[PDB]
Design an enzyme around this catalytic site. Sequence first.
Site, PDB file in Angstrom:
ATOM      1  N   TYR A 168       0.909  -1.190   0.188  1.00  0.00           N
ATOM      2  CA  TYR A 168       0.014   0.114   0.109  1.00  0.00           C
ATOM      3  C   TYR A 168       0.943   1.263   0.030  1.00  0.00           C
ATOM      4  O   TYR A 168       1.865   1.228   0.331  1.00  0.00           O
ATOM      5  CB  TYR A 168      -1.045  -0.015   1.021  1.00  0.00           C
ATOM      6  CG  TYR A 168      -0.388   0.448   2.448  1.00  0.00           C
ATOM      7  CD1 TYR A 168      -0.257   1.614   2.848  1.00  0.00           C
ATOM      8  CD2 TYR A 168       0.337  -0.645   3.202  1.00  0.00           C
ATOM      9  CE1 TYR A 168       0.234   2.135   4.104  1.00  0.00           C
ATOM     10  CE2 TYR A 168       1.161  -0.116   4.241  1.00  0.00           C
ATOM     11  CZ  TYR A 168       1.163   1.106   4.691  1.00  0.00           C
ATOM     12  OH  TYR A 168       1.581   1.436   6.016  1.00  0.00           O
ATOM     13  N   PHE A 199       2.879  10.973   4.279  1.00  0.00           N
ATOM     14  CA  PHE A 199       2.907  10.025   3.188  1.00  0.00           C
ATOM     15  C   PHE A 199       3.514   8.864   3.719  1.00  0.00           C
ATOM     16  O   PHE A 199       4.713   9.057   4.086  1.00  0.00           O
ATOM     17  CB  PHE A 199       3.621  10.530   1.891  1.00  0.00           C
ATOM     18  CG  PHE A 199       3.278  11.727   1.387  1.00  0.00           C
ATOM     19  CD1 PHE A 199       2.315  12.014   0.473  1.00  0.00           C
ATOM     20  CD2 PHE A 199       4.111  12.939   1.720  1.00  0.00           C
ATOM     21  CE1 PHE A 199       2.204  13.106   0.174  1.00  0.00           C
ATOM     22  CE2 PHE A 199       3.816  14.081   1.381  1.00  0.00           C
ATOM     23  CZ  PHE A 199       3.003  14.250   0.479  1.00  0.00           C
ATOM     24  N   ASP A 200       2.953   7.532   3.300  1.00  0.00           N
ATOM     25  CA  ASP A 200       3.413   6.380   3.931  1.00  0.00           C
ATOM     26  C   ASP A 200       3.656   5.521   2.599  1.00  0.00           C
ATOM     27  O   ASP A 200       2.399   5.271   2.149  1.00  0.00           O
ATOM     28  CB  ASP A 200       2.586   5.936   5.123  1.00  0.00           C
ATOM     29  CG  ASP A 200       2.978   4.594   5.751  1.00  0.00           C
ATOM     30  OD1 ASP A 200       4.022   4.028   5.927  1.00  0.00           O
ATOM     31  OD2 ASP A 200       1.890   3.989   6.134  1.00  0.00           O
ATOM     32  N   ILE A 203      -7.430   0.339  11.003  1.00  0.00           N
ATOM     33  CA  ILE A 203      -8.481   1.161  10.975  1.00  0.00           C
ATOM     34  C   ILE A 203      -9.654   0.748  10.450  1.00  0.00           C
ATOM     35  O   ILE A 203      -9.705  -0.202   9.468  1.00  0.00           O
ATOM     36  CB  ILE A 203      -8.230   2.699  10.542  1.00  0.00           C
ATOM     37  CG1 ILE A 203      -7.402   2.617   8.918  1.00  0.00           C
ATOM     38  CG2 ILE A 203      -7.172   3.347  11.117  1.00  0.00           C
ATOM     39  CD1 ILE A 203      -7.544   3.880   8.271  1.00  0.00           C
ATOM     40  N   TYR A 235      -9.156   7.923  12.306  1.00  0.00           N
ATOM     41  CA  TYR A 235      -9.060   8.345  13.378  1.00  0.00           C
ATOM     42  C   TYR A 235      -9.746   9.425  14.153  1.00  0.00           C
ATOM     43  O   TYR A 235      -9.407   9.827  15.315  1.00  0.00           O
ATOM     44  CB  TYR A 235      -7.523   8.752  13.272  1.00  0.00           C
ATOM     45  CG  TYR A 235      -6.234   7.839  12.800  1.00  0.00           C
ATOM     46  CD1 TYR A 235      -5.919   7.094  13.875  1.00  0.00           C
ATOM     47  CD2 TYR A 235      -6.107   7.835  11.604  1.00  0.00           C
ATOM     48  CE1 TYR A 235      -4.828   6.046  13.088  1.00  0.00           C
ATOM     49  CE2 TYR A 235      -5.450   6.744  11.175  1.00  0.00           C
ATOM     50  CZ  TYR A 235      -4.739   6.001  11.844  1.00  0.00           C
ATOM     51  OH  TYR A 235      -3.622   5.071  11.522  1.00  0.00           O
ATOM     52  N   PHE A 269      -5.775   5.999   0.302  1.00  0.00           N
ATOM     53  CA  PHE A 269      -4.896   4.639   0.082  1.00  0.00           C
ATOM     54  C   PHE A 269      -4.897   4.422  -1.286  1.00  0.00           C
ATOM     55  O   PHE A 269      -5.974   4.168  -1.967  1.00  0.00           O
ATOM     56  CB  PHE A 269      -5.114   3.797   1.131  1.00  0.00           C
ATOM     57  CG  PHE A 269      -5.042   4.216   2.482  1.00  0.00           C
ATOM     58  CD1 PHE A 269      -3.747   3.777   3.208  1.00  0.00           C
ATOM     59  CD2 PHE A 269      -6.019   4.585   3.260  1.00  0.00           C
ATOM     60  CE1 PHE A 269      -3.826   4.144   4.626  1.00  0.00           C
ATOM     61  CE2 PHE A 269      -5.902   4.923   4.501  1.00  0.00           C
ATOM     62  CZ  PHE A 269      -4.814   4.731   5.106  1.00  0.00           C
TER      63      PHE A 269
HETATM   64  C1  LIG Z   1      -8.969  -0.717  15.363  1.00  0.00           C
HETATM   65  O1  LIG Z   1      -8.360   0.563  15.168  1.00  0.00           O
HETATM   66  C2  LIG Z   1      -7.136   0.775  14.981  1.00  0.00           C
HETATM   67  C3  LIG Z   1      -5.970  -0.162  14.874  1.00  0.00           C
HETATM   68  C4  LIG Z   1      -4.604   0.018  14.749  1.00  0.00           C
HETATM   69  C5  LIG Z   1      -4.237   1.192  14.829  1.00  0.00           C
HETATM   70  C6  LIG Z   1      -2.639   1.600  14.732  1.00  0.00           C
HETATM   71  C7  LIG Z   1      -2.542   2.254  13.314  1.00  0.00           C
HETATM   72  C8  LIG Z   1      -2.753   1.310  12.065  1.00  0.00           C
HETATM   73  N1  LIG Z   1      -2.752   2.048  10.918  1.00  0.00           N
HETATM   74  C9  LIG Z   1      -3.705   1.735   9.960  1.00  0.00           C
HETATM   75  O2  LIG Z   1      -4.657   0.900  10.377  1.00  0.00           O
HETATM   76  C10 LIG Z   1      -3.791   2.359   8.805  1.00  0.00           C
HETATM   77  C11 LIG Z   1      -4.267   1.372   7.507  1.00  0.00           C
HETATM   78  C12 LIG Z   1      -3.024   0.352   7.328  1.00  0.00           C
HETATM   79  C13 LIG Z   1      -1.665   1.262   6.926  1.00  0.00           C
HETATM   80  C14 LIG Z   1      -1.456   2.199   7.851  1.00  0.00           C
HETATM   81  N2  LIG Z   1      -2.651   3.008   8.352  1.00  0.00           N
HETATM   82  C15 LIG Z   1      -2.278   4.516   8.443  1.00  0.00           C
HETATM   83  O3  LIG Z   1      -3.079   5.265   8.916  1.00  0.00           O
HETATM   84  C16 LIG Z   1      -0.988   5.051   8.221  1.00  0.00           C
HETATM   85  C17 LIG Z   1      -0.249   4.689   9.499  1.00  0.00           C
HETATM   86  C18 LIG Z   1       1.272   3.977   9.314  1.00  0.00           C
HETATM   87  C19 LIG Z   1       1.904   3.681  10.487  1.00  0.00           C
HETATM   88  O4  LIG Z   1       3.084   2.805  10.409  1.00  0.00           O
HETATM   89  C20 LIG Z   1       3.420   2.421   9.248  1.00  0.00           C
HETATM   90  C21 LIG Z   1       1.424   4.031  11.644  1.00  0.00           C
HETATM   91  O5  LIG Z   1       2.261   3.707  12.669  1.00  0.00           O
HETATM   92  C22 LIG Z   1       3.128   4.741  13.149  1.00  0.00           C
HETATM   93  C23 LIG Z   1       0.422   4.653  11.869  1.00  0.00           C
HETATM   94  O6  LIG Z   1       0.001   5.140  13.182  1.00  0.00           O
HETATM   95  C24 LIG Z   1      -0.966   5.844  13.391  1.00  0.00           C
HETATM   96  C25 LIG Z   1      -0.498   5.176  10.853  1.00  0.00           C
HETATM   97  C26 LIG Z   1      -1.190   6.401   7.914  1.00  0.00           C
HETATM   98  C27 LIG Z   1       0.322   7.093   7.879  1.00  0.00           C
HETATM   99  C28 LIG Z   1       0.401   8.553   7.467  1.00  0.00           C
HETATM  100  C29 LIG Z   1      -0.360   8.814   6.309  1.00  0.00           C
HETATM  101  C30 LIG Z   1      -1.763   8.203   6.198  1.00  0.00           C
HETATM  102  C31 LIG Z   1      -1.686   6.732   6.737  1.00  0.00           C
HETATM  103  C32 LIG Z   1      -1.724   0.389  11.879  1.00  0.00           C
HETATM  104  C33 LIG Z   1      -0.404   0.950  11.603  1.00  0.00           C
HETATM  105  C34 LIG Z   1       0.679   0.107  11.298  1.00  0.00           C
HETATM  106  C35 LIG Z   1       0.321  -1.439  11.340  1.00  0.00           C
HETATM  107  C36 LIG Z   1      -0.977  -1.852  11.572  1.00  0.00           C
HETATM  108  O7  LIG Z   1      -1.407  -3.077  11.558  1.00  0.00           O
HETATM  109  C37 LIG Z   1      -0.243  -4.150  11.011  1.00  0.00           C
HETATM  110  C38 LIG Z   1       0.820  -4.356  12.027  1.00  0.00           C
HETATM  111  O8  LIG Z   1       0.441  -4.166  13.041  1.00  0.00           O
HETATM  112  O9  LIG Z   1       1.820  -4.915  11.809  1.00  0.00           O
HETATM  113  C39 LIG Z   1      -1.938  -0.958  11.891  1.00  0.00           C
HETATM  114  C40 LIG Z   1      -5.001   2.390  15.111  1.00  0.00           C
HETATM  115  C41 LIG Z   1      -6.415   1.937  15.252  1.00  0.00           C
HETATM  116  O10 LIG Z   1      -7.593   3.172  15.289  1.00  0.00           O
HETATM  117  C42 LIG Z   1      -7.086   4.234  15.568  1.00  0.00           C
END
Ligand SMILES: COc1ccc(CC[C@@H](NC(=O)[C@@H]2CCCCN2C(=O)[C@H](c2cc(OC)c(OC)c(OC)c2)C2CCCCC2)c2cccc(OCC(=O)O)c2)cc1OC
Length: 128
Positions: free
Chosen positions: A45, A55-56, A75, A101, A118
């Site tokens: 992704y 950006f990620d 999320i 969020y 995304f």
């Molecule tokens: C059920 O709700 C949630 C569950 C998880 C989270 C944590 C953020 C959670 N982030 C996300 O769900 C979304 C969708 C999947 C890709 C990452 N992502 C993000 O928002 C992206 C993200 C990426 C991140 O790291 C790669 C990250 O960790 C520092 C992060 O933290 C808030 C957010 C963002 C980054 C900035 C530009 C817009 C995207 C997360 C991050 C990294 C990995 C991951 O799962 C796989 C793993 O653990 O290996 C889950 C928040 C949650 O709600 C707020």
Amino acid sequence: GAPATVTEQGEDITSKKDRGVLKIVKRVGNGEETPMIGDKVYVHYKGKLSNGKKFDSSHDRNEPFVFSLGKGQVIKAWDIGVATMKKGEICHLLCKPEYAYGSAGSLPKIPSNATLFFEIELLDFKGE
Ligand SMILES: COc1ccc(CC[C@@H](NC(=O)[C@@H]2CCCCN2C(=O)[C@H](c2cc(OC)c(OC)c(OC)c2)C2CCCCC2)c2cccc(OCC(=O)O)c2)cc1OC
């Protein structure tokens, strides 16, 4: 750009039909199957804040992006969105704050009430 296309042509894949998750298929995947809750999914992704400055991408990872679907590991927008994807499919997903969020944000990276965009490729998925 890509987000504008999703706004004007995207499909609302939310249960409530609130336009909180909008999708466009960019590349059609293989076969017919889409993952079930509990399936392990493997994705590449990239993502961004809609309004600018962060950006990620998974291409920066050491290991592949893996999570169990429908288990709140990501999320809400992703639990909804990736569930609709076929193996090999690439989609664009526009995600309102209620499916990301919220008003809390995830500060200082993600502001309050942020919309996220995304591009997601579903590599594979496997049963529990
Ligand atoms: C059920 O709700 C949630 C569950 C998880 C989270 C944590 C953020 C959670 N982030 C996300 O769900 C979304 C969708 C999947 C890709 C990452 N992502 C993000 O928002 C992206 C993200 C990426 C991140 O790291 C790669 C990250 O960790 C520092 C992060 O933290 C808030 C957010 C963002 C980054 C900035 C530009 C817009 C995207 C997360 C991050 C990294 C990995 C991951 O799962 C796989 C793993 O653990 O290996 C889950 C928040 C949650 O709600 C707020």
